[PDB]
Design a protein around this nucleic acid. Structure first.
Lengths: 144, 197, 102, 90, 102, 121, 51
RNA sequence: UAUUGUGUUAGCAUGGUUUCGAGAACA
């Protein structure tokens, strides 16, 4: 008699959805699939605008610090770099502020997260020759 | 080919003056707002008078017969302002709380169990994560013969195990964990007050 | 050519109408119990016409990546084609989906 | 150009931007903020579902004019404003 | 790369002296403080006693650690747990230029 | 489709090239080569294989394409790290550096002939 | 020739008791705002970049 | 926390995805 091979049979055909240990998955995917498109369309656009004006970019940041804190804590001489701007995007997923000390987002004190400029392992890996929907801005053309 | 032949606007007679002058009837989109308490009572008076007028049904007399049965046994609010005290508030008033952490409230062993969910940040809260129950052994608790019988009678045999001889008390009438936890501790003390009599 | 962008459904008048009834019933959910309590205490069975347009049964299952009102389950909330495209795009692997088993 | 955000504890609050209509750039919400604030209602502590419900009536009664305040059960637009004020005093 | 604040070299300079170098300073400070500011016993037992000299000493340590928390430049999350700060610091540096294959 | 003539060197582009694998196995296998095919598929997924492979009782060949560095590991695996017995290893052709790739998914060609024609053949 | 920072100031200490939220700090904010508007007046590939 | 018209002629004989019906996979 195969015992391990038949595991989970009882909770497959003789169990209710509301009377089982299985949790729903559609709820998480609802807010996850939508956020992927936001980072793709607004990703390159944000970086292009930041790099549009190479010089004189740090002047705006320096003046802003004189109004919030008054005294420039990060002040440095002309012979030292001020900072490096990193293209970040806002958070759209309504995550709950859990009390997990080992979490990566529970201790977030700002509404902006870094964006990877290059990725070698695409998350939406297709199972075949099919492409990803919404990744063809230019309309198609037929030989006619 | 089909479903395309249009029709001219034939509504042009001078007789049709009462048209396009007022908002249409109530729409389902405007029903978002709730019904005021004045209108809900009006419908009850209009419907009760219609049924007695002669609008009877085969399944209407059977309902009345069942209601009359509960009257004889004495399960009706029929009598041949008020400011009462709710049972929950009454228990709060009568409760001997401890004076600081170093004072023992109870005088018998007891185990408290509760499930706490931990994991990655979930977009939604997981239900069925606010249970709290207390267990205690009757054999360890020293009591008289008359008092011991009453303990199992109030809770019944469902909350008592005949193999080991332990009693489990579960209370879950609140969504929050903190609110539910405090509720268990109040009812537990009240039970002992009536048992010793 | 170009499979649909499954995050944003197209326009559909019938699909939007179904969601409209959900909001109306939620606000009127309290009034539904009051109508049943008064009749039960008096011991008389009568109709409640006001519940016809704001009833819970007026709402039915519908496809989110769609607009058809048939062939939708409570687990996937998608039609036959909605699940096929979602599963073939590589989105259910993280959620424990092994297509090897029959 | 842009107003500051002095929230409690942190230094950023998206809720005040949405209700004020500065970030969303929604003209209908921008005019709604100046209207409710004058009436004396705590709009900053309102639900997301209720803010949009009131804003819909303001735009509907503006484009078509103040001539169709009809509501189910013979309700006037002034009753909602007064009722909401009590629940949200200033 | 007209400006000097966007070249490849300056990015690496700020990615070591502010990410990993600053993380180590906080890690040692937290451990050093615990040695010079011990408690009566276990952390769990100290909360059930509500005794003096334990609530006071613990409160002082909380402020000292908060004031000794460097602000990361590359990372904007501003994690408070020292274990997480060091774990995530290496991930950002490894993904910049450490790898050579998928 | 720029060739390697543009600026590949030992600084950062040394591990940014593609190519094709070189292997030709031959020899008897257990059962009908089922063990070899299963073992090669599991390892191939980790390396993100793109080409195909053919496995049989005796014949075993194919065309595997991917990264220049990724394919290097497979050469040693399929030459000495073989549980079964191997007589010799052959080669047909190889090429390093090429823009884009031909295949998209890894698959193994299996004999799906009907059982009725097996007796006639 | 090459050392940017002379030394470090990593010393375990708290902070001062008073808060930098007095009337003097608020008054100085208005002065730091005028310069921002004056700089934006001289339009030079900066007006559209910020807005 | 709803928001960019058409559930209409026109798919076997020009169509993208999916699939029913017949045929094939060997050295």
């Amino acid at each position: 008699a195969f015992r391990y091979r038949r595991e989970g049979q009882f909770t497959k055909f003789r169990v209710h959805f509301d009377r089982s240990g299985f949790r729903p998955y559609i709820d998480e995917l609802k807010w996850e699939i939508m956020d992927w498109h936001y980072k793709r369309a607004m990703g390159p656009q944000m970086k292009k605008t930041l790099m549009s004006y190479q010089e004189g970019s740090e002047k705006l940041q320096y003046m802003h610090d004189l109004i919030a804190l008054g005294t420039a804590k990060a002040k440095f001489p002309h012979a030292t770099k001020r900072f490096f701007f990193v293209p970040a995007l806002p958070v759209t997923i309504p995550y709950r502020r859990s009390s997990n000390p080992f979490c990566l987002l529970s201790a977030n004190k700002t509404g902006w997260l870094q964006w990877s400029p290059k990725q070698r392992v695409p998350f939406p890996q297709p199972l075949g020759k099919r492409k990803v929907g919404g990744t063809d801005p230019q309309p198609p053309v037929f030989p006619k | 080919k089909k479903k395309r032949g249009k029709k001219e606007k034939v509504i042009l007679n001078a007789e049709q003056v009462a048209t396009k002058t007022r908002l249409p009837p109530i729409r389902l989109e405007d029903r978002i707002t709730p019904e005021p308490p004045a209108t809900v009572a009006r419908n009850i008076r209009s419907q009760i008078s219609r049924a007695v007028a002669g609008w009877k049904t085969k399944r209407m007399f059977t309902y009345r017969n069942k209601y009359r049965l509960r009257r004889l046994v004495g399960m009706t609010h029929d009598i041949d302002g008020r400011t009462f005290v709710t049972p929950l508030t009454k228990l709060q008033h009568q409760a001997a709380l401890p004076r600081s952490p170093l004072h023992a409230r109870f005088d018998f062993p007891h185990t408290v169990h509760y499930d706490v969910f931990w994991g990655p940040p979930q977009v939604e809260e997981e239900p069925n994560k606010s249970g709290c129950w207390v267990s205690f052994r009757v054999a360890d608790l020293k009591l008289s013969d008359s008092q011991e019988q009453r303990l199992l009678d109030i809770l019944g045999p469902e909350r008592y195990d005949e193999q080991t001889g332990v009693v489990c008390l579960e209370a879950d009438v609140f969504p929050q964990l903190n609110h539910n936890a405090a509720y268990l501790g109040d009812i537990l003390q009240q039970l002992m007050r009536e048992v010793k009599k | 050519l170009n499979p649909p962008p499954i995050a944003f459904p197209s326009f559909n008048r019938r699909c939007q109408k179904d969601w409209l009834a959900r909001r109306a019933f939620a606000e009127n959910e309290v009034n539904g119990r009051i109508y049943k309590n008064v009749y039960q205490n008096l011991g008389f069975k009568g109709p409640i016409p006001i519940l016809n347009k704001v009833g819970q049964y007026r709402i039915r299952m519908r496809c989110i990546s769609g607009g058809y009102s048939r062939g939708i389950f409570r687990f996937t909330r998608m039609a036959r084609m909605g699940m096929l495209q979602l599963a073939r795009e590589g989105w259910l692997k993280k959620y424990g989906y092994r297509p090897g088993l029959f | 150009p842009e107003a500051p955000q002095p929230p409690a504890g942190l230094h950023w609050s998206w809720w005040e931007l949405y209700v004020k209509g500065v970030n969303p750039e929604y003209p209908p919400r921008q005019r709604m903020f100046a209207f409710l604030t004058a009436q004396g209602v705590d709009v900053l502590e309102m639900e997301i579902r209720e803010i949009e419900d009131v804003t819909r009536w303001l735009e509907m009664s503006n484009v078509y004019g103040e001539k169709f305040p009809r509501f189910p059960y013979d309700v006037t637009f002034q009753d909602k404003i007064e009722a909401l004020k009590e629940k949200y005093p200033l | 790369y007209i400006t000097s604040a966007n070249f490849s070299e300056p990015v690496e300079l700020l990615s070591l002296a502010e990410d990993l170098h600053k993380a180590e300073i906080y890690t040692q400070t937290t451990e050093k403080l615990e040695k010079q500011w011990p408690a009566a016993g276990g952390v769990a037992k100290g909360i059930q006693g509500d005794q003096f000299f334990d609530v006071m000493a613990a409160a002082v340590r909380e402020d000292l650690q908060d004031q000794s928390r460097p602000v990361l430049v590359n990372e904007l999350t501003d994690h408070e747990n020292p274990y997480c700060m060091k774990r995530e610091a290496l991930r950002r540096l490894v993904l910049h230029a450490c790898t050579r294959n998928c | 489709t720029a060739p390697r003539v543009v600026r590949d060197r030992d600084e950062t582009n040394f591990h940014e090239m593609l190519g094709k694998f070189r292997f030709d196995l031959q020899g008897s296998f257990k059962e009908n080569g089922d063990m070899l095919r299963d073992s090669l598929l599991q390892v191939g997924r980790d390396l993100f294989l793109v080409g195909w492979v053919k496995c049989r009782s005796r014949f075993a060949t194919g065309h595997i394409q991917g990264d220049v560095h990724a394919l290097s590991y497979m050469r040693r695996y399929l030459e000495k790290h073989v549980d079964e017995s191997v007589s010799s290893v052959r080669f047909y052709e190889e090429n390093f550096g090429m823009p884009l790739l031909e295949y998209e998914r890894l698959s193994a060609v299996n004999d799906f002939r009907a059982p009725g024609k097996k007796q006639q053949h | 020739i090459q050392q940017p920072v002379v030394l470090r100031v990593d010393i375990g200490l708290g902070d001062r008791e008073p808060v930098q939220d007095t009337t003097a700090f608020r008054k100085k904010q208005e002065q730091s705002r005028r310069t921002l508007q004056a700089a934006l007046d001289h339009d030079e590939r900066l007006a559209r970049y910020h807005g």
